[PDB]
Amino acid sequence: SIEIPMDLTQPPTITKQSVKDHIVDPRDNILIECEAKGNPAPSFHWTRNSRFFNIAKDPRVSMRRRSGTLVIDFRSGGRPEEYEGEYQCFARNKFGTALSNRIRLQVSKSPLWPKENLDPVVVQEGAPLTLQCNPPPGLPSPVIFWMSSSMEPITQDKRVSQGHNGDLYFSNVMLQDMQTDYSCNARFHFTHTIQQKNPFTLKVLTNNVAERTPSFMYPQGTSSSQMVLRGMDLLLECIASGVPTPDIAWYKKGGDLPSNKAKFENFNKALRITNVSEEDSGEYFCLASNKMGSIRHTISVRVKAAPYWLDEPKNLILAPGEDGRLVCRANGNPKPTVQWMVNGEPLQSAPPNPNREVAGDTIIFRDTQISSRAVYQCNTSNEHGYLLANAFVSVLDVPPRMLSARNQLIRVILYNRTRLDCPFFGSPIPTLRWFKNGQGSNLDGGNYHVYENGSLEIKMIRKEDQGIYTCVATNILGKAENQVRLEVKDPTRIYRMPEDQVAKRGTTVQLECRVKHDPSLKLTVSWLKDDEPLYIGNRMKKEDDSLTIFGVAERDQGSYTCMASTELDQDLAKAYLTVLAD
Amino acid sequence: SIEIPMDLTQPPTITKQSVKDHIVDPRDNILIECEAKGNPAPSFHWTRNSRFFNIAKDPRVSMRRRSGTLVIDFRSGGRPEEYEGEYQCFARNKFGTALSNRIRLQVSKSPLWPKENLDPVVVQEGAPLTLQCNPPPGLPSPVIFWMSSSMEPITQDKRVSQGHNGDLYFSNVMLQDMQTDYSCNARFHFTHTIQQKNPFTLKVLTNVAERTPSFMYPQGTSSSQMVLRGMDLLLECIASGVPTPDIAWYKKGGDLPSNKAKFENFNKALRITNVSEEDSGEYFCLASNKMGSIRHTISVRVKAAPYWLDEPKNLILAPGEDGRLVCRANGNPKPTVQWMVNGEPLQSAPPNPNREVAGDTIIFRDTQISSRAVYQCNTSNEHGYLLANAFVSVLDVPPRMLSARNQLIRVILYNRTRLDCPFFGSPIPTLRWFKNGQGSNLDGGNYHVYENGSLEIKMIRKEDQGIYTCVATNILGKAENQVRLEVKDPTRIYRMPEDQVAKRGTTVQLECRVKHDPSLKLTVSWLKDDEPLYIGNRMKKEDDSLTIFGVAERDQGSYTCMASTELDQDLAKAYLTVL
Numbered sequence A: 001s002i003e004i005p006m007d008l009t010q011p012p013t014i015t016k017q018s019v020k021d022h023i024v025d026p027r028d029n030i031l032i033e034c035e036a037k038g039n040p041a042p043s044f045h046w047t048r049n050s051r052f053f054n055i056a057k058d059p060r061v062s063m064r065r066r067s068g069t070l071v072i073d074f075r076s077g078g079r080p081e082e083y084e085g086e087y088q089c090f091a092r093n094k095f096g097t098a099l100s101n102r103i104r105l106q107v108s109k110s111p112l113w114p115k116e117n118l119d120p121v122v123v124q125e126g127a128p129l130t131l132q133c134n135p136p137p138g139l140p141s142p143v144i145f146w147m148s149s150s151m152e153p154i155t156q157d158k159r160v161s162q163g164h165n166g167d168l169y170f171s172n173v174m175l176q177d178m179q180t181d182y183s184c185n186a187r188f189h190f191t192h193t194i195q196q197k198n199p200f201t202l203k204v205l206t207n208n209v210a211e212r213t214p215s216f217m218y219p220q221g222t223s224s225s226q227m228v229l230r231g232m233d234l235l236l237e238c239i240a241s242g243v244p245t246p247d248i249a250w251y252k253k254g255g256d257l258p259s260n261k262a263k264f265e266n267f268n269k270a271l272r273i274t275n276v277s278e279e280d281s282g283e284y285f286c287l288a289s290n291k292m293g294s295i296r297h298t299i300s301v302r303v304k305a306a307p308y309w310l311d312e313p314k315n316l317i318l319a320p321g322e323d324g325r326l327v328c329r330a331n332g333n334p335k336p337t338v339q340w341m342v343n344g345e346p347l348q349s350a351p352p353n354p355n356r357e358v359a360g361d362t363i364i365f366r367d368t369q370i371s372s373r374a375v376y377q378c379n380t381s382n383e384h385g386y387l388l389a390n391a392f393v394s395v396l397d398v399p400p401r402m403l404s405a406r407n408q409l410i411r412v413i414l415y416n417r418t419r420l421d422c423p424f425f426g427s428p429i430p431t432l433r434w435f436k437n438g439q440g441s442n443l444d445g446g447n448y449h450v451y452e453n454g455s456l457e458i459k460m461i462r463k464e465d466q467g468i469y470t471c472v473a474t475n476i477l478g479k480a481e482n483q484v485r486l487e488v489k490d491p492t493r494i495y496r497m498p499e500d501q502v503a504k505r506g507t508t509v510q511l512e513c514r515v516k517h518d519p520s521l522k523l524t525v526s527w528l529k530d531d532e533p534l535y536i537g538n539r540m541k542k543e544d545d546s547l548t549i550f551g552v553a554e555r556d557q558g559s560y561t562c563m564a565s566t567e568l569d570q571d572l573a574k575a576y577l578t579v580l581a582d
Numbered sequence B: 001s002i003e004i005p006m007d008l009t010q011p012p013t014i015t016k017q018s019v020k021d022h023i024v025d026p027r028d029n030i031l032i033e034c035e036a037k038g039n040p041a042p043s044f045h046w047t048r049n050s051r052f053f054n055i056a057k058d059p060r061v062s063m064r065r066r067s068g069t070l071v072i073d074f075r076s077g078g079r080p081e082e083y084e085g086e087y088q089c090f091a092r093n094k095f096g097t098a099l100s101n102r103i104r105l106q107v108s109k110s111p112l113w114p115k116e117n118l119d120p121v122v123v124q125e126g127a128p129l130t131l132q133c134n135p136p137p138g139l140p141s142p143v144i145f146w147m148s149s150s151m152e153p154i155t156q157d158k159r160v161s162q163g164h165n166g167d168l169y170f171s172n173v174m175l176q177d178m179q180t181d182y183s184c185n186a187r188f189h190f191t192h193t194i195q196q197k198n199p200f201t202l203k204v205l206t207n208v209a210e211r212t213p214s215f216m217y218p219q220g221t222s223s224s225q226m227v228l229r230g231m232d233l234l235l236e237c238i239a240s241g242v243p244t245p246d247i248a249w250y251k252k253g254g255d256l257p258s259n260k261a262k263f264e265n266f267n268k269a270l271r272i273t274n275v276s277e278e279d280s281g282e283y284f285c286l287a288s289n290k291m292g293s294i295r296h297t298i299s300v301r302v303k304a305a306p307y308w309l310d311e312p313k314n315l316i317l318a319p320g321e322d323g324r325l326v327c328r329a330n331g332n333p334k335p336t337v338q339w340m341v342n343g344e345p346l347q348s349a350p351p352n353p354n355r356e357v358a359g360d361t362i363i364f365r366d367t368q369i370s371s372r373a374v375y376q377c378n379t380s381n382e383h384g385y386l387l388a389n390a391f392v393s394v395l396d397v398p399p400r401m402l403s404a405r406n407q408l409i410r411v412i413l414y415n416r417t418r419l420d421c422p423f424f425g426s427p428i429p430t431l432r433w434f435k436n437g438q439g440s441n442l443d444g445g446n447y448h449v450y451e452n453g454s455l456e457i458k459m460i461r462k463e464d465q466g467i468y469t470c471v472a473t474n475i476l477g478k479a480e481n482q483v484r485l486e487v488k489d490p491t492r493i494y495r496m497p498e499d500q501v502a503k504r505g506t507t508v509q510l511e512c513r514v515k516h517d518p519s520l521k522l523t524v525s526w527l528k529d530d531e532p533l534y535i536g537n538r539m540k541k542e543d544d545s546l547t548i549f550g551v552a553e554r555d556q557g558s559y560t561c562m563a564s565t566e567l568d569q570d571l572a573k574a575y576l577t578v579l
């Protein structure tokens, strides 16, 4: 994007705002951030739950100065729970209105366990069991762990373990499972509060045990489906029941699991993919292998995606009569529908503009004038999420300006690459060109590259590349110039490097390190034993050109690295020293 | 006390109410119980915070029919915490008004820890340390326990342990104490909620020389504690020394009661379970150490909330009869007695010539139909109060029998028995028992009579069978009741099964011959080891024996023949071994 200096008339641009999913602690005061720039002093106003939000009628809510940030303070009283809901910020000035994202403000709660009286569980020895937890809801979901009601630890293993939902599955119940009662505990993220379910008590009955084929406990049926969004974590689970404790092995149709992202958890009963993508979609099956038999359960994984920018709409900097366009393209599954708004008002009912023609996801401005100076908003949305973007159209008439300091100085060593910065601005976007030493030929093509923001990269510097560089930005209203002096220094090169050698114990070894460098530079040389900095000690002599070691033994054996560095350059030399044995 | 039947006119009486300290869950609907009786069906009203509580103006509050029990519903909205306060119930009818205890409705609290940023504690090795917990107050009091932030347990011993206040004391800090971080935790059983304090981090510094012991928790040479009668007395002494000192507990001029005194917290705490006025005195603790010994004295005084010596009972009188209401409560300090008539102070009550008050006793002389009312006694000291309702009833009904006529009670020979003969009379009737028209009153050996009219027979012989007559008499007349007591012969197993050793494939038999009374249903069962029988499968249950065929390893054990009837039980045990 291209910004506009603040001295020039400008529609508001939102700088900082709260996150979409704004979860808060039930103790702290609450802050809904909304800050925005604008050449005329921008005024802010809010909407809570799609209706106007009057700050003046609520004493706890106050708005910061020169911004729209709201602070709600509970020192006088009140509780944050009553402020949950969707909030939207609006930043206005005489030239237009910019919108923020919809802040879904929720407070992280720790609700108690619903009062329930649990009867003593009775089960046959060797039978499968499921103790459902059913934890209270929290934001984020609380961490579920099982303990005795006396808070002694329950040991989980391949035979008895909990799923992601929290329920505790016993593949086959044993007598020893009566050693403890099973109470579910939920730990909440922001308060670290634990809520405890009533404890379960088991009563096992002995046989009058016979073996049994595996059977699936958690994923009922032969097949199942899951839907996970792009970039989220995919968590599949398979729980089996069998008298000989089954072993769960995961496989994928037509492909192996990605080694860099897939991980096994919960004793190979859980498979987690970290950063899922369209490629991760498919058919994942799990085998509950056992001494008696083996059965398979299949899972159809479809990966959808919330919209993400391919081309985000950028501000339109225009001169009167110049043609431009706003392009708003997001990608996602399903394909995101584009909705256009002008100053927070739907485009279908906005004040008509003859210069403005809308088509699909693109707005075209032909012969733009001082009118239609407004902030357009694009909302690209699908069932799984939205993307909201602000882009203003600014029609102005100012000559080109230079934004950086004049006659800068940049030093660089010979073969390095470098970048000269020359940011600029003009009412119609001025064209920028670089010249060297008063040459009429502009610098572009081989070895040179010009970026949109005016900076020039030299990819491989020659000694001839030293000198004065002038960047010139020009439009019909005039031109501006800027100067930067590039100085090529001589490279720091180690022309006598330490050589690998094999020495018998007691000898004196010398590793030479002679370096040439630019005289107008502070060169510092250091040594590294193996790959860590070497401490200079007794029997070690660090000359300016070498490093000598007296009475070598087994400890001195290894790799020595001479490092010669100046403020702009670095050079490494690595040698190996072996020490024989007798 | 003496109850009055509901068909006779009587002032109201409070049957059920909430506790004085009524803690409620913040989720459930609130229920403030107050139920009463009265022959004219009583009406009910409430006072919240000593002023009238208007149920009509509140749509959440509703009063149950035929009672004063309030139900506060929060489905439409609201929170229980906004109904906290003092609630008194008044049960009224044409004959008087009865009061309930003041109900202090409070909602339970499991408060979070305030947002705090704890500095890393730094301490010299061997120095004393106190990690303060300081939990925000909650109802009821939470159980404090220390734990790592990763929820690993913290090991307590003689050197490092926590006091009753919850602070963790280190008599001398060691280098190993940096192995884990220290986080306080409060557990609330009423809501099942654990609140975790931010963890402390320890950083010890090494410079150890020895040091004499010094007291940490009970500062100074002497302190004072006051404990209420019936509660637990907990004394704590924490000492600090370079050699970890040992605390020893003693009492001046007396030995600790072995039945009530307990040493807790590695002998750093003394607990008296059921304290009394005798346990009050001087308890001292020695912090013995290799370097020195120091004593801390604690003066324990035992005060008492009021407890009834004589609880005021309902006065049941006839016109022209004299009676008294006695309200005696013992407590330290001595409880002050305050009398009320129909919930109105006796000073401002309408004067009555028959009633004369004196200290804690009210005397009625020449009682008439007038002045029938419910009197309240409130005996209070700074530690607590006792509230009691008792009404004066003036009726003229003859004695009435409250049980069924011609009752039948059956019992085995040597069981103890009890015959119930509930009665009532306008003047309190004298009750008497007789047998088979022997005329002599039944009392003394083998017989006991209770205040409510019941008759207990301790040992029953075969001669005690027959008809028993209960006679309740007063100046207005007499009533009688008949109970037929039938003694049955005890069920005895006279041929018991004997232990035996029998090999495979042998028809084994365990005999169990039972003699019972012919007019009784006999049920004979068997028990393998200690579980009930399974009938069938190569096991034949005869009426007087049991036979098992194809004996194996499962048959070896202990059999139990059980012979039972409606009134009797008999057990016989044998051991069977199989080759």
Ligand SMILES: *[C@@H]1O[C@H](CO)[C@@H](O[C@@H]2O[C@H](CO)[C@@H](O[C@@H]3O[C@H](CO[C@H]4O[C@H](CO)[C@@H](O)[C@H](O[C@H]5O[C@H](CO)[C@@H](O)[C@H](O)[C@@H]5O)[C@@H]4O)[C@@H](O)[C@H](O[C@H]4O[C@H](CO)[C@@H](O)[C@H](O)[C@@H]4O[C@H]4O[C@H](CO)[C@@H](O)[C@H](O)[C@@H]4O)[C@@H]3O)[C@H](O)[C@H]2NC(C)=O)[C@H](O)[C@H]1NC(C)=O
Pocket: A049, A050, A084, A085, A086, A099, A100, A101, A102, A104, A379, A380, A381, A382, A383, A384, A385, A386, A388
């Ligand atoms: C850009 O365009 C998009 C699409 O057009 C807009 O997104 C729309 O936003 C509106 C308003 O926020 C949504 O309507 C709301 O839907 C709530 C239920 O949503 C859940 O179910 C739907 C399916 O029915 C799912 O699509 C949602 O999932 C999406 O969102 C979640 C996160 O929230 C993501 O994780 C998903 O991936 C999806 O992205 C949800 O699962 C519904 O509850 C809500 O109704 C409440 O709010 C309105 C006012 O907004 C009240 O009128 C109403 O009475 C409800 O309020 C009650 O409850 C609250 C407390 O809960 C009380 O405070 C109130 O007093 C009252 O009692 C509303 O209907 C709409 O669903 C969504 N579009 C889609 C396709 O989902 C973007 O907003 C837009 N962006 C900008 C900047 O304009």
Ligand SMILES: *[C@@H]1O[C@H](CO)[C@@H](O[C@@H]2O[C@H](CO)[C@@H](O[C@@H]3O[C@H](CO[C@H]4O[C@H](CO)[C@@H](O)[C@H](O[C@H]5O[C@H](CO)[C@@H](O)[C@H](O)[C@@H]5O)[C@@H]4O)[C@@H](O)[C@H](O[C@H]4O[C@H](CO)[C@@H](O)[C@H](O)[C@@H]4O[C@H]4O[C@H](CO)[C@@H](O)[C@H](O)[C@@H]4O)[C@@H]3O)[C@H](O)[C@H]2NC(C)=O)[C@H](O)[C@H]1NC(C)=O
Pocket: B049, B050, B084, B085, B086, B100, B101, B102, B378, B379, B380, B381, B382, B383, B384, B385, B387
């Ligand atoms: C039989 O007789 C006895 C003795 O006459 C009566 O006992 C008295 O009862 C009254 C009424 O409840 C008490 O008056 C109240 O006192 C409150 C302060 O007392 C507290 O502090 C003192 C020290 O200053 C302690 O000694 C007390 O502790 C003792 O008692 C409690 C039980 O109450 C025990 O648990 C202890 O172990 C001690 O034994 C107390 O802790 C005082 O706050 C209160 O005044 C509030 O309420 C009235 C209306 O009720 C308002 O007018 C007033 O403005 C106050 O209101 C504010 O505070 C309350 C909370 O307190 C909030 O809810 C309000 O919204 C508002 O913010 C009142 O004055 C008296 O203390 C007590 N005396 C004794 C010795 O126990 C029996 O009730 C009586 N029985 C019957 C059935 O009638």
Ligand SMILES: *[C@@H]1O[C@H](CO)[C@@H](O[C@@H]2O[C@H](CO)[C@@H](O[C@@H]3O[C@H](CO[C@H]4O[C@H](CO)[C@@H](O)[C@H](O)[C@@H]4O)[C@@H](O)[C@H](O[C@H]4O[C@H](CO)[C@@H](O)[C@H](O)[C@@H]4O)[C@@H]3O)[C@H](O)[C@H]2NC(C)=O)[C@H](O)[C@H]1NC(C)=O
Pocket: A413, A415, A416, A417, A523, A524, A526, A565, A566, A567, A568, A569, A570
């Ligand atoms: C092309 O040009 C670039 C830029 O000129 C060169 O990259 C520079 O290389 C030099 C030398 O290798 C770097 O100088 C060294 O930087 C180290 C990192 O410091 C940064 O990061 C730390 C946090 O890690 C920050 O706190 C700090 O503010 C810096 O931002 C320093 O640790 C070095 O300190 C000491 O190093 C030696 C001794 O080891 C001494 O001689 C030094 O004088 C100094 O006391 C040192 O400062 C420099 O940071 C690099 N800049 C960038 C932008 O990368 C390329 O090497 C060059 N390419 C070529 C020649 O091929």
Ligand SMILES: *[C@@H]1O[C@H](CO)[C@@H](O[C@@H]2O[C@H](CO)[C@@H](O[C@@H]3O[C@H](CO)[C@@H](O)[C@H](O[C@H]4O[C@H](CO)[C@@H](O)[C@H](O)[C@@H]4O)[C@@H]3O)[C@H](O)[C@H]2NC(C)=O)[C@H](O)[C@H]1NC(C)=O
Pocket: B412, B415, B416, B523, B564, B565, B566, B567, B568, B569
């Ligand atoms: C003295 O009197 C006491 C008081 O009655 C008496 O104790 C009670 O005995 C009866 C009868 O034996 C018990 O009733 C039993 O209760 C158990 C449950 O606890 C039931 O399972 C029993 O049913 C079995 O036994 C019946 C006996 O006839 C069978 O008819 C029936 O089919 C079942 O097999 C039976 O109802 C009662 O439980 C006890 N009291 C208590 C508190 O347990 C006592 O036995 C008398 N004798 C002596 C010597 O004390």
Ligand SMILES: *[C@@H]1O[C@H](CO)[C@@H](O[C@@H]2O[C@H](CO)[C@@H](O[C@@H]3O[C@H](CO)[C@@H](O)[C@H](O)[C@@H]3O)[C@H](O)[C@H]2NC(C)=O)[C@H](O)[C@H]1NC(C)=O
Pocket: A419, A421, A422, A423, A451, A453, A454, A455
């Ligand atoms: C004009 O545009 C160019 C191209 O985008 C900008 O060059 C880029 O500048 C950024 C910030 O200085 C560089 O990021 C840096 O990357 C290094 C890793 O190499 C990291 O250590 C730094 O902390 C920093 O993030 C980026 O590499 C650089 N890109 C190139 C190709 O040089 C330039 O800054 C813009 N100029 C102006 C005035 O906006």
Ligand SMILES: *[C@@H]1O[C@H](CO)[C@@H](O[C@@H]2O[C@H](CO)[C@@H](O[C@@H]3O[C@H](CO)[C@@H](O)[C@H](O)[C@@H]3O)[C@H](O)[C@H]2NC(C)=O)[C@H](O)[C@H]1NC(C)=O
Pocket: B418, B420, B421, B422, B450, B452, B453, B454, B456
């Ligand atoms: C008249 O007063 C006597 C004296 O208390 C009453 O006898 C007592 O009655 C109670 C209630 O039935 C008995 O308690 C019961 O004990 C059994 C055996 O332990 C227990 O299982 C029950 O749950 C209950 O607690 C008590 O034992 C008994 N006392 C004696 C000495 O027999 C009698 O009931 C009163 N009569 C009336 C009509 O109220």
